[PDB]
């Protein structure tokens, strides 16, 4: 089997992407944030504290003839940005782009943190990291991909995120029309539960390539590109007037600037992030200070190849017995 679904930016900055997901019988369609950096599929629901729902579409298990309470199971998750959610668990039928999993754990939120409430466009998350990170207790549950894998034509999914435009998540096949040149594959460590890999280096603008190993995670649920302070300083040094602002919480730059591109290495291959992808707009409405899309990972504890990086590529998440990651230009 295969599936194919369009993923759409939630706003004009590409802060996140939502993908429609059918849950239950009859189908309830919710728009979920596909997140290769976590491993829980959770949704706003009829069980979510009423004051914490503000415009989201909710899953109502009592209206699904295939929903079953997973007795005794609870979940609770905290994300890198400080947000969190928790609740109980149902199993139900879940379909993405025509690909159906029966008996998928659907984690129903009883509580969500303010950032989730305040974002009316995201109805929940669909985790695509390794199932070892799943938070369901006392019996850990499998991701949608893990459950689908054996049925797929090939045990892969692909992320093709758009810049200020829709893109695609495919399951079970590689669309050879969706990228240019060849896909370069690189090793993955699953030791931390992430799609963790090592970039071979970087360049800033038309500058020379610096060969250096950068361990990090391919994370569709993180907006920006977080890299070591040395790398980030070298990038922003090429933008007149750019500076790191402790009050804003990262590098900012004059909105009048033209940003240089940033290249990262995948083996001997190179992925080029155009400068415009690194512009996240005014820090506050009407400001002429703009927020940068490349930020320091110092104090995160890990480098993160988030959407800024991934949207410059066609990315293969290869879930074979030994997983690997592939990147192509597009």
Swiss-Prot record:
Q: Which GO terms describe its molecular function?
A: aspartic-type endopeptidase activity
**Residue ranges occupied by any Peptidase A1 domain in the UniProt entry:** 17-328
The reactions it catalyses are: Hydrolysis of proteins with specificity similar to that of pepsin A, prefers hydrophobic residues at P1 and P1', but does not cleave 14-Ala-|-Leu-15 in the B chain of insulin or Z-Glu-Tyr. Clots milk
Annotated coiled-coil positions are: none
Q: Which UniProt keywords apply?
A: Aspartyl protease, Disulfide bond, Hydrolase, Protease, Signal, Zymogen
Top-level taxon of the source organism: Eukaryota
Entry annotation: catalytic residues: 35, 199
- One Gene Ontology biological process: proteolysis
EC no. given is 3.4.23.22
Q: What class of enzyme is it?
A: hydrolase
- Here the disulfide bonds are 255-290
The text of the family note is: Belongs to the peptidase A1 family.
What name appears for this protein in its UniProt entry? Answer: Endothiapepsin
Name the gene behind this protein.
EAPA
């Amino acid at each position: 089997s295969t599936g194919s679904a369009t993923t759409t930016p939630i706003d004009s900055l590409d802060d996140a992407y939502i993908t429609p997901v059918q849950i239950g019988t009859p189908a309830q369609t919710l728009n979920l944030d596909f997140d290769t950096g976590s491993s829980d599929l959770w949704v706003f629901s009829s069980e979510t504290t009423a004051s914490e729902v503000d415009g989201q579409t909710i899953y109502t298990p009592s209206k699904s003839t295939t929903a079953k309470l997973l007795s005794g199971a609870t979940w609770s998750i905290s994300y890198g940005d400080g947000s969190s959610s928790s609740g109980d668990v149902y199993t139900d039928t879940v379909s993405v782009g025509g690909l159906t999993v029966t008996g998928q754990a659907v984690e129903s939120a009883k509580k969500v943190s303010s950032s989730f409430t305040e974002d009316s466009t995201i109805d929940g998350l669909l985790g695509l990291a390794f199932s070892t990170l799943n938070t369901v207790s006392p019996t850990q549950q499998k991701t949608f991909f893990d459950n689908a894998k054996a049925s797929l034509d090939s045990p892969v999914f692909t992320a093709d995120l758009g810049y200020h435009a829709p893109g695609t998540y495919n399951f079970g096949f590689i669309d050879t029309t969706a990228y240019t040149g060849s896909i370069t594959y690189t090793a993955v460590s699953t030791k931390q539960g992430f799609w963790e890999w090592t970039s071979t280096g970087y360049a800033v603008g038309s500058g020379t390539f610096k060969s250096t190993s950068i361990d990090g995670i391919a994370d569709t649920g993180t907006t920006l590109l977080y890299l070591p302070a040395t790398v980030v300083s070298a990038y922003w040094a090429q933008v007149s007037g750019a500076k790191s602002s402790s009050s804003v919480g990262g590098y900012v730059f004059p909105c009048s600037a033209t940003l240089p591109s940033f290249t990262f290495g995948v083996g001997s291959a190179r992925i080029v992030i155009p400068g415009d992808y690194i512009d996240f707009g005014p820090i506050s409405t009407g400001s002429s200070s703009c927020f940068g899309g490349i930020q320091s990972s110092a104090g995160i504890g890990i480098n993160i190849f988030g959407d800024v990086a991934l949207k410059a590529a066609f990315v293969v998440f290869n879930g074979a017995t030994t997983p690997t990651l592939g990147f192509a230009s597009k």
